[PDB]
Amino acid sequence: QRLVREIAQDFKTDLRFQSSAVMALQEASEAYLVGLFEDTNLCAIHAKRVTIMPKDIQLARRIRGERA
Amino acid sequence: KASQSRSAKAGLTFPVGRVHRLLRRGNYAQRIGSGAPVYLTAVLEYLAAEILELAGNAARDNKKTRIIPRHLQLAIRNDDELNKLLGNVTIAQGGVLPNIHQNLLPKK
Amino acid sequence: VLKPETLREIQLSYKSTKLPKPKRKNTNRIVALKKVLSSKRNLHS
Amino acid sequence: RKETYSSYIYKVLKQTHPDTGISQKSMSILNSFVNDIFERIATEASKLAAYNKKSTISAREIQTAVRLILPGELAKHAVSEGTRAVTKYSS
Amino acid sequence: LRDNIQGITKPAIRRLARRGGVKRISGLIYEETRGVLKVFLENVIRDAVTYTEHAKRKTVTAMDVVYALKRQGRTLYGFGG
DNA sequence: TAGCACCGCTTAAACGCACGTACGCGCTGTCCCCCGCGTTTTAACCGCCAAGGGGATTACTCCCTAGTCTCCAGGCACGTGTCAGATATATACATCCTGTGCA
DNA sequence: TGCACAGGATGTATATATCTGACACGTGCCTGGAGACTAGGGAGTAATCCCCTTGGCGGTTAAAACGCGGGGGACAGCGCGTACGTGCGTTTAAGCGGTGCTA
């Protein structure tokens, strides 16, 4: 809630939130992050390493196309 | 005096009249064929029944009488055609199907 | 599996038997005699 | 007043499994899913008609749309159920 | 409000990755994860806030969040849709 | 009336730090397969020989269809009552204390 | 002298009951179906004109295929060094419910 409050306050003055909105934002964040993490896991596996590394996430993003 | 709903005439539980009104209000076309709302009601009822059956099977196998989002996620992710249908959809508090890559396990 | 209610049922079961007569003595041997006849412990014990 | 499919979902569920209960969260999930898939089919129908330049959305258009959206086996079952509904309506 | 990018902590990233089944992790992962989360949140929040401001509004409702996510193609069920 | 703010106990999730160990990287030799290249084989078009078939576009002509206003009377939604469950606390002894009469 | 038990003390798993959630049954309003009017978009009808294969055929060509050398790319081993895993003691502020305002 602190992070979302800060980001919204940076984006727009004097905003308010619904509690349900903040909860939905948390749920969506967790879903996206778990998807990203599993993609990173598959990437690291392909590298033949168990230690996931930032490049694995970057690759996941590129193949997904969030930064291509 | 007495009358019977168009849903009963079609033999559908979903409110075909409400579907017809929602279609009309959605302004999707200037003219709406009377067969469109019934057809929509039928397909929607079939999909609802299928998903509900899957959820109920999940509930029974979990041995819990009340469907919670976990059960819905299990059902949706299991049925591969629905899984591919809804791949961009996330279910609140649904969680994920357990999955471990073989090479991560020490053995067996 | 055994309780004082089992003792009460035995007291009710006492009505069938009629012959035996009591006596008195005290020693630690008699204390152990009471102890075996008051085990109330199962084969698991 | 506000109206939702929740009651109809509850009805169909009870038809499927009498002894089974359902949470409000799952009820809302199902209501949102049916609303979404209705919207999807309606948009597909609209787009098709627009290309065909047909002013009337008939059951036939919705049928083809349903084949488009749904996987082949699910599409076949959907079309079969819709046609059965049409036949019962014809009575 | 300050430094809240740190507020996510390492252990939260740990638990989330644990859900992802990762057996082995690297220290650098946390910063990258935070950056990714930051840009994701920024985009979702901007979309939601513009959805709100349309309606001559001041409170971001769950409808604004869910429809903003729908516009990003991420579809979310169970919050009154 | 749902969000905001301050109170103020209660943990427990974060954190610093300690030890190690198994994992990632650097470098090894191996060997097999896939590039650079040359020779043979196949697919494709030109011109032969000029079309008929049938398909998509276009228009006219009803007529049927559900867009429209309207009444009838309802069945569906909003709410309260009832029934159940999870929580709460007496009890019938349970697990024992302890003066003192007995061996 | 030390033991046996007569007389008495905290407790508690067992048992009886009180403190919270969810579903079904009652009201009652924005309705959904129905009756009749309506017309112009859909559908049935009829060209009509244009684009699609005929069909295999030889004489060619450009691309495909096949063969070969080899050399360097992939990759299985592994020495080793460390930076994440597991396990403490310790702190914070995340969670809980509560009181007062309001936008």
XYZ file of C-alpha atoms (C1' of nucleotides) in Angstrom:
599
model
C 0.000 0.000 0.000
C 2.902 2.363 0.702
C 4.382 1.724 -2.751
C 1.098 2.194 -4.599
C 0.278 5.322 -2.575
C 3.690 6.760 -3.431
C 3.467 5.969 -7.143
C -0.046 7.411 -7.435
C 0.944 10.504 -5.439
C 3.815 11.019 -7.865
C 1.419 10.566 -10.787
C -1.507 12.635 -9.479
C -2.135 14.939 -6.526
C -4.809 14.320 -3.885
C -5.817 10.871 -5.128
C -7.807 8.415 -3.031
C -8.101 4.639 -3.299
C -10.796 2.098 -2.752
C -9.490 -0.601 -0.415
C -10.732 -3.171 -2.936
C -8.734 -1.443 -5.675
C -5.528 -1.738 -3.633
C -6.270 -5.405 -2.948
C -6.860 -6.051 -6.652
C -3.590 -4.296 -7.489
C -1.773 -6.544 -5.018
C -3.380 -9.657 -6.513
C -2.512 -8.627 -10.079
C 1.057 -7.796 -9.059
C 1.524 -11.196 -7.430
C 0.102 -12.995 -10.473
C 2.391 -11.149 -12.878
C 5.426 -11.714 -10.652
C 4.812 -15.460 -10.314
C 4.470 -15.714 -14.095
C 7.710 -13.789 -14.576
C 9.492 -15.949 -12.000
C 8.423 -19.220 -13.629
C 9.557 -17.902 -17.028
C 12.900 -16.985 -15.442
C 13.113 -20.486 -13.962
C 12.687 -22.062 -17.392
C 15.304 -19.686 -18.819
C 17.847 -20.532 -16.110
C 17.113 -24.235 -16.627
C 17.869 -23.816 -20.324
C 21.138 -22.110 -19.390
C 21.907 -25.291 -17.378
C 22.133 -23.337 -14.123
C 20.017 -23.574 -10.995
C 20.955 -20.045 -9.859
C 18.600 -17.636 -11.610
C 20.403 -14.482 -12.744
C 19.138 -11.074 -13.945
C 19.915 -11.963 -17.567
C 17.404 -14.813 -17.232
C 14.663 -12.315 -16.348
C 15.782 -9.990 -19.148
C 15.577 -12.866 -21.639
C 12.120 -13.782 -20.327
C 11.009 -10.174 -20.858
C 12.406 -10.054 -24.395
C 10.781 -13.328 -25.466
C 7.572 -12.076 -23.858
C 8.191 -8.791 -25.681
C 7.884 -6.364 -22.766
C 11.260 -4.868 -23.748
C 11.922 -6.164 -27.291
C -53.764 -14.484 -18.256
C -51.071 -17.084 -17.651
C -47.789 -16.957 -19.553
C -44.485 -18.811 -19.779
C -41.039 -17.254 -20.026
C -39.161 -17.479 -23.309
C -36.409 -19.200 -21.320
C -38.759 -22.047 -20.387
C -39.983 -22.178 -23.993
C -36.357 -22.553 -25.088
C -35.673 -24.759 -22.068
C -32.897 -22.579 -20.638
C -32.374 -21.347 -17.083
C -30.486 -18.152 -17.997
C -32.642 -15.034 -18.575
C -32.943 -14.934 -22.368
C -34.972 -11.723 -22.143
C -32.245 -10.022 -20.125
C -29.696 -11.191 -22.703
C -31.855 -9.743 -25.488
C -32.130 -6.389 -23.718
C -28.398 -6.301 -22.987
C -27.668 -7.015 -26.658
C -30.042 -4.258 -27.780
C -28.610 -1.740 -25.305
C -25.088 -2.706 -26.391
C -26.034 -1.238 -29.806
C -24.078 -3.996 -31.551
C -26.505 -3.790 -34.489
C -29.519 -1.818 -35.672
C -31.534 -5.052 -35.992
C -31.351 -8.102 -33.713
C -32.540 -11.494 -34.905
C -34.831 -13.184 -32.389
C -32.658 -16.311 -32.586
C -29.567 -14.482 -31.360
C -30.630 -14.068 -27.686
C -31.807 -17.682 -27.362
C -28.620 -18.968 -29.002
C -26.529 -16.820 -26.634
C -28.505 -18.102 -23.659
C -27.934 -21.710 -24.725
C -24.180 -21.365 -25.272
C -23.787 -19.422 -22.017
C -25.709 -22.072 -20.090
C -23.572 -24.830 -21.598
C -20.330 -23.069 -20.665
C -21.601 -22.323 -17.152
C -22.691 -25.932 -16.629
C -19.337 -27.247 -17.864
C -17.221 -24.976 -15.657
C -19.493 -25.654 -12.667
C -19.220 -29.422 -13.195
C -15.426 -29.167 -13.325
C -15.422 -27.062 -10.150
C -17.692 -29.573 -8.419
C -15.399 -32.445 -9.367
C -12.485 -30.448 -7.954
C -14.481 -29.827 -4.767
C -15.304 -33.513 -4.324
C -11.696 -34.564 -4.908
C -10.585 -31.922 -2.401
C -13.493 -33.158 -0.214
C -14.851 -29.662 0.475
C -18.492 -28.730 -0.069
C -17.928 -25.019 -0.859
C -16.188 -23.990 -4.078
C -13.429 -21.489 -3.268
C -11.237 -19.814 -5.947
C -8.606 -22.542 -5.504
C -11.079 -25.053 -6.939
C -11.925 -22.806 -9.886
C -8.246 -22.321 -10.721
C -7.690 -26.082 -10.512
C -10.603 -26.778 -12.861
C -9.715 -24.060 -15.385
C -6.013 -24.922 -15.533
C -6.615 -28.681 -15.726
C -8.942 -28.772 -18.747
C -6.429 -28.114 -21.499
C -8.838 -26.552 -24.001
C -10.184 -24.189 -21.349
C -6.607 -23.611 -20.174
C -5.624 -22.475 -23.667
C -8.869 -20.493 -23.950
C -8.253 -18.471 -20.785
C -4.460 -18.244 -20.809
C -4.494 -14.460 -20.382
C -6.983 -14.655 -17.480
C -5.987 -14.713 -13.807
C -8.372 -15.906 -11.084
C -8.201 -14.041 -7.776
C -6.623 -16.205 -5.040
C -6.680 -19.111 -7.496
C -3.017 -19.971 -7.002
C -1.173 -22.264 -9.408
C -1.011 -25.963 -10.212
C 1.979 -27.564 -8.445
C 4.827 -28.162 -10.879
C 8.470 -29.110 -10.311
C 11.058 -29.455 -13.061
C 12.607 -32.923 -12.940
C 16.211 -31.686 -13.020
C 15.549 -29.626 -9.882
C 14.823 -32.741 -7.827
C 17.901 -34.533 -6.427
C 16.635 -37.824 -7.894
C 13.435 -39.876 -8.436
C -11.989 -47.915 28.059
C -12.560 -48.410 31.794
C -14.123 -45.911 34.195
C -15.875 -45.798 37.594
C -19.050 -46.408 35.575
C -17.567 -49.813 34.743
C -17.219 -50.323 38.498
C -20.882 -49.367 38.909
C -21.847 -51.887 36.219
C -19.805 -54.502 38.088
C -21.702 -53.600 41.259
C -24.884 -54.203 39.274
C -23.220 -57.393 38.036
C -22.549 -58.323 41.678
C -26.253 -59.146 42.080
C -25.774 -62.475 40.281
C -23.055 -63.694 42.660
C -24.130 -64.396 46.235
C -21.707 -66.695 48.049
C -18.372 -64.968 48.810
C -17.661 -63.455 52.222
C -15.093 -60.769 53.096
C -12.239 -60.491 55.595
C -9.697 -57.942 56.810
C -5.921 -57.723 56.835
C -3.329 -55.085 55.965
C 0.170 -55.309 54.554
C 2.045 -53.911 51.569
C 1.484 -57.283 49.895
C -2.248 -56.646 50.295
C -1.672 -53.143 48.899
C -0.171 -54.688 45.765
C -3.085 -57.144 45.726
C -5.365 -54.105 45.512
C -3.078 -52.599 42.872
C -3.379 -55.476 40.394
C -7.150 -55.562 40.951
C -7.246 -51.800 40.262
C -5.002 -51.591 37.189
C -7.482 -50.205 34.630
C -4.730 -50.295 32.000
C -4.942 -51.687 28.480
C -2.815 -54.110 26.472
C -1.303 -51.028 24.822
C 0.033 -49.962 28.222
C -31.816 -2.082 -8.094
C -28.990 -4.223 -9.485
C -29.373 -7.533 -11.317
C -26.769 -10.268 -11.782
C -26.538 -13.799 -13.149
C -25.675 -15.028 -9.630
C -29.160 -16.436 -9.015
C -29.130 -18.364 -12.299
C -25.622 -19.647 -11.554
C -26.880 -20.872 -8.179
C -29.857 -22.551 -9.864
C -27.752 -24.373 -12.467
C -25.218 -25.407 -9.806
C -27.967 -26.881 -7.626
C -29.205 -28.730 -10.705
C -25.711 -30.150 -11.257
C -24.778 -31.025 -7.655
C -27.489 -30.810 -4.967
C -25.233 -31.461 -1.964
C -22.542 -28.942 -2.964
C -22.222 -25.400 -1.635
C -20.577 -22.365 -3.192
C -18.759 -19.292 -1.900
C -19.671 -15.710 -2.740
C -16.209 -15.216 -4.265
C -16.740 -18.144 -6.636
C -20.233 -16.846 -7.437
C -18.748 -13.488 -8.427
C -16.024 -15.198 -10.463
C -18.669 -17.137 -12.390
C -20.824 -14.035 -12.918
C -17.826 -12.114 -14.251
C -16.853 -15.009 -16.521
C -20.318 -15.333 -18.063
C -20.528 -11.562 -18.555
C -17.088 -11.489 -20.192
C -17.756 -14.380 -22.560
C -21.116 -12.874 -23.532
C -19.318 -9.629 -24.344
C -16.670 -11.466 -26.379
C -19.257 -13.298 -28.478
C -21.276 -10.115 -29.018
C -18.217 -8.204 -30.255
C -17.274 -11.029 -32.614
C -20.822 -11.018 -34.002
C -20.742 -7.238 -34.448
C -17.428 -7.363 -36.313
C -18.602 -10.194 -38.572
C -21.851 -8.410 -39.438
C -19.937 -5.187 -40.117
C -17.713 -6.969 -42.635
C -20.715 -8.746 -44.190
C -22.677 -5.431 -44.032
C -25.684 -7.213 -42.515
C -27.921 -5.140 -40.241
C -29.413 -8.188 -38.475
C -27.487 -10.358 -36.027
C -29.184 -13.705 -36.568
C -28.565 -16.916 -34.644
C -26.476 -18.061 -37.633
C -23.991 -15.200 -37.139
C -23.736 -15.947 -33.416
C -23.194 -19.622 -34.260
C -20.252 -18.901 -36.557
C -18.837 -16.506 -33.939
C -19.123 -19.219 -31.271
C -17.152 -21.505 -33.568
C -14.523 -18.768 -33.870
C -14.059 -18.067 -30.159
C -14.319 -21.555 -28.695
C -11.959 -24.504 -29.203
C -13.214 -26.929 -31.808
C -14.741 -29.538 -29.514
C -16.195 -26.928 -27.165
C -17.439 -25.044 -30.228
C -19.127 -28.206 -31.521
C -20.836 -28.809 -28.190
C -21.912 -25.158 -27.978
C -23.374 -25.177 -31.496
C -25.167 -28.463 -30.796
C -26.730 -27.045 -27.625
C -27.692 -23.820 -29.393
C -29.328 -25.731 -32.236
C -31.243 -27.837 -29.710
C -32.467 -24.627 -28.077
C -33.496 -23.335 -31.514
C -35.449 -26.532 -32.188
C -37.250 -26.297 -28.847
C -38.049 -22.654 -29.641
C -39.471 -23.754 -33.002
C -42.091 -25.877 -31.203
C 6.822 8.320 1.780
C 10.388 7.383 0.834
C 12.532 4.357 -0.042
C 9.396 2.211 -0.339
C 10.990 0.417 -3.298
C 13.042 -1.212 -0.537
C 9.875 -1.820 1.487
C 9.122 -4.916 -0.601
C 12.086 -6.481 1.292
C 14.074 -9.493 0.144
C 11.937 -12.143 1.960
C 8.804 -11.187 -0.004
C 10.659 -11.679 -3.292
C 11.939 -14.924 -1.778
C 8.442 -16.226 -0.996
C 7.061 -15.176 -4.389
C 9.924 -16.913 -6.186
C 9.303 -19.921 -3.925
C 5.789 -20.065 -5.346
C 7.517 -20.086 -8.741
C 9.409 -23.218 -7.683
C 12.910 -21.741 -7.990
C 15.358 -23.898 -6.027
C 18.303 -21.465 -6.236
C 18.371 -17.650 -6.226
C 20.938 -14.873 -6.708
C 21.291 -11.641 -4.758
C 21.031 -9.453 -7.859
C 17.538 -10.832 -8.604
C 15.915 -8.605 -5.973
C 16.854 -5.286 -7.597
C 15.768 -6.455 -11.060
C 12.502 -7.768 -9.618
C 11.899 -4.409 -7.945
C 12.528 -2.544 -11.195
C 10.151 -4.795 -13.127
C 7.496 -4.372 -10.442
C 8.036 -0.606 -10.491
C 7.455 -0.251 -14.229
C 4.478 -2.636 -14.136
C 2.882 -0.688 -11.290
C 3.574 2.637 -12.997
C 1.800 1.533 -16.174
C -1.175 -0.052 -14.401
C -1.578 2.923 -12.058
C -1.393 5.475 -14.871
C -4.075 3.586 -16.795
C -6.290 3.267 -13.714
C -5.905 6.939 -12.757
C -6.784 8.105 -16.264
C -9.800 5.774 -16.176
C -10.773 7.486 -12.914
C -10.204 11.073 -14.042
C -12.614 10.616 -16.961
C -15.548 10.226 -14.573
C -15.039 13.577 -12.783
C -13.795 11.486 -9.920
C -11.432 11.412 -6.957
C -11.479 7.809 -5.638
C -9.877 5.079 -7.742
C -12.362 2.205 -7.653
C -11.776 -1.490 -8.287
C -13.608 -1.022 -11.589
C -10.910 1.415 -12.722
C -8.173 -1.067 -11.793
C -9.831 -4.070 -13.417
C -10.689 -2.288 -16.663
C -7.227 -0.712 -16.832
C -5.780 -4.215 -16.534
C -8.178 -5.385 -19.250
C -6.793 -2.644 -21.497
C -3.313 -4.040 -20.804
C -4.738 -7.421 -21.860
C -4.337 -8.855 -18.344
C -7.801 -10.157 -17.459
C -8.781 -10.409 -13.790
C -11.894 -12.112 -12.403
C -13.578 -12.086 -9.007
C -13.834 -8.390 -8.127
C -17.419 -7.593 -9.068
C -17.109 -7.807 -12.852
C -20.984 5.477 4.485
C -16.403 4.054 3.087
C -11.826 6.071 3.645
C -8.592 8.383 6.645
C -6.092 9.241 10.708
C -4.069 8.232 15.495
C -3.936 4.631 19.683
C -1.444 1.095 21.329
C -0.593 -4.043 22.458
C 1.386 -8.543 19.933
C 3.706 -10.884 17.923
C 6.848 -12.639 13.642
C 8.611 -11.451 9.661
C 13.079 -8.927 8.697
C 17.315 -8.394 9.711
C 22.608 -9.003 11.040
C 25.704 -12.505 11.450
C 27.890 -16.846 11.749
C 29.385 -21.305 9.240
C 30.075 -24.427 4.556
C 29.254 -26.516 0.690
C 27.783 -27.369 -3.490
C 27.250 -24.777 -7.174
C 29.129 -21.671 -11.285
C 33.061 -20.498 -13.837
C 37.859 -21.352 -16.202
C 40.152 -24.150 -18.430
C 40.849 -28.993 -20.441
C 40.825 -32.465 -24.466
C 37.662 -34.758 -27.810
C 35.320 -35.766 -31.606
C 31.302 -35.193 -34.888
C 28.540 -32.552 -37.478
C 27.450 -28.821 -40.224
C 29.725 -24.937 -43.236
C 32.285 -23.962 -47.930
C 32.284 -25.770 -52.118
C 31.598 -29.011 -56.790
C 28.841 -31.939 -59.380
C 23.809 -33.887 -60.685
C 19.138 -33.745 -60.541
C 14.483 -31.558 -60.281
C 10.748 -27.616 -60.753
C 9.424 -24.218 -63.028
C 8.236 -21.126 -67.250
C 7.712 -20.114 -72.589
C 5.173 -21.258 -76.257
C 2.256 -24.850 -78.199
C -2.985 -24.413 -78.628
C -7.816 -20.467 -77.376
C -10.901 -21.640 -75.099
C -15.711 -22.936 -71.718
C -17.159 -22.941 -66.914
C -18.726 -21.032 -63.323
C -18.002 -17.816 -60.148
C -18.658 -12.782 -57.720
C -20.876 -8.694 -58.531
C -25.016 -6.216 -59.449
C -29.947 -5.038 -59.407
C -35.165 -5.461 -58.747
C -39.028 -7.067 -55.817
C -41.763 -8.303 -52.313
C -42.601 -9.345 -47.260
C -41.557 -10.479 -43.183
C -39.293 -9.194 -39.420
C -38.694 -7.199 -34.792
C -38.231 -1.473 -33.740
C -42.094 0.892 -31.601
C -45.797 2.226 -27.848
C -48.489 0.276 -24.672
C -50.809 -2.746 -20.789
C -50.609 -6.623 -17.750
C -48.898 -8.730 -13.933
C -44.906 -10.667 -12.368
C -40.374 -12.986 -10.727
C -36.673 -11.374 -9.499
C -33.880 -8.665 -6.102
C -33.306 -6.503 -1.134
C -33.996 -7.549 3.032
C -35.073 -10.089 7.650
C -35.443 -14.779 10.383
C -34.117 -18.958 11.130
C -30.853 -22.594 11.596
C -25.631 -24.139 12.438
C -21.066 -23.753 13.604
C -17.280 -22.294 15.910
C -16.297 -20.737 20.306
C -16.868 -20.620 25.248
C -16.824 -22.593 30.144
C -18.773 -25.864 34.062
C -17.701 -30.816 35.994
C -17.130 -35.124 37.699
C -13.876 -36.494 38.769
C -8.075 -35.944 37.522
C -3.971 -35.256 39.010
C -2.377 -34.614 43.654
C -1.271 -32.245 48.763
C -0.535 -33.174 53.503
C -1.348 -34.089 58.731
C -1.244 -38.511 61.606
C -2.613 -42.969 63.085
C -0.560 -47.589 62.250
C 3.299 -51.348 61.798
C 11.385 -44.569 62.759
C 9.123 -44.886 58.912
C 4.982 -46.359 56.501
C -0.312 -46.280 55.437
C -4.219 -43.448 54.759
C -7.536 -40.077 56.650
C -8.616 -35.803 55.467
C -8.042 -32.322 52.259
C -6.116 -29.014 47.179
C -5.535 -27.418 43.367
C -6.795 -28.468 38.349
C -8.858 -30.447 33.490
C -10.307 -33.618 29.815
C -14.692 -34.333 29.677
C -18.966 -32.395 28.919
C -22.662 -28.647 28.602
C -23.557 -24.384 26.727
C -22.955 -19.325 24.551
C -21.223 -16.354 21.018
C -20.933 -15.483 15.371
C -22.150 -16.719 9.616
C -24.573 -18.273 6.182
C -28.881 -19.746 3.634
C -34.244 -19.657 2.833
C -38.347 -17.353 3.086
C -41.188 -12.623 2.682
C -42.174 -8.123 0.466
C -42.767 -5.384 -3.475
C -41.092 -2.654 -8.277
C -39.061 -1.848 -12.205
C -39.773 -4.518 -14.750
C -40.453 -9.237 -19.347
C -44.075 -11.036 -22.334
C -47.484 -10.037 -24.942
C -50.884 -7.230 -28.833
C -50.935 -4.721 -32.437
C -48.783 -1.187 -35.937
C -45.225 -0.618 -38.639
C -41.355 -0.517 -43.151
C -37.469 -1.067 -45.170
C -33.326 -4.648 -44.875
C -33.245 -9.383 -45.821
C -33.934 -12.724 -48.892
C -35.479 -14.645 -53.486
C -34.593 -13.771 -58.071
C -31.289 -12.854 -62.929
C -28.372 -11.548 -65.309
C -23.357 -10.530 -66.831
C -18.977 -10.172 -67.511
C -14.429 -11.661 -66.087
C -11.230 -14.554 -64.262
C -9.790 -19.154 -63.549
C -7.807 -24.073 -65.416
C -7.374 -26.699 -70.196
C -3.567 -30.506 -69.899
C 0.753 -32.788 -71.228
C 4.361 -31.431 -73.750
C 10.073 -30.266 -75.118
C 13.455 -27.229 -74.557
C 15.493 -25.071 -71.732
C 17.057 -22.501 -66.929
C 17.643 -21.478 -61.535
C 17.250 -23.687 -57.360
C 17.458 -28.118 -54.879
C 19.754 -31.885 -53.736
C 23.466 -34.787 -52.770
C 28.738 -35.746 -51.660
C 32.730 -34.642 -49.629
C 36.770 -32.228 -46.080
C 37.680 -30.697 -42.123
C 38.067 -27.862 -38.426
C 36.324 -25.752 -34.920
C 31.685 -25.887 -31.545
C 29.657 -28.346 -28.589
C 30.249 -30.567 -24.496
C 31.416 -33.826 -20.761
C 35.232 -33.483 -16.652
C 36.646 -31.220 -13.148
C 39.829 -27.671 -9.671
C 38.384 -24.479 -6.805
C 36.429 -20.408 -4.600
C 33.009 -18.267 -3.159
C 28.164 -16.344 -2.376
C 23.532 -18.285 -1.208
C 21.434 -21.937 1.997
C 20.351 -23.058 7.032
C 20.311 -21.579 11.613
C 20.499 -18.770 15.432
C 19.595 -13.922 18.533
C 17.480 -9.867 18.052
C 14.041 -5.527 16.233
C 10.398 -3.540 13.578
C 6.449 -2.410 12.234
C 2.694 -5.292 10.103
C -1.704 -6.905 12.074
C -5.468 -6.718 15.337
C -9.462 -4.177 17.023
C -10.804 0.493 18.788
C -12.633 6.248 18.352
C -13.407 10.035 16.178
C -14.388 12.781 11.520
C -15.531 13.456 6.734
C -15.826 14.166 1.757
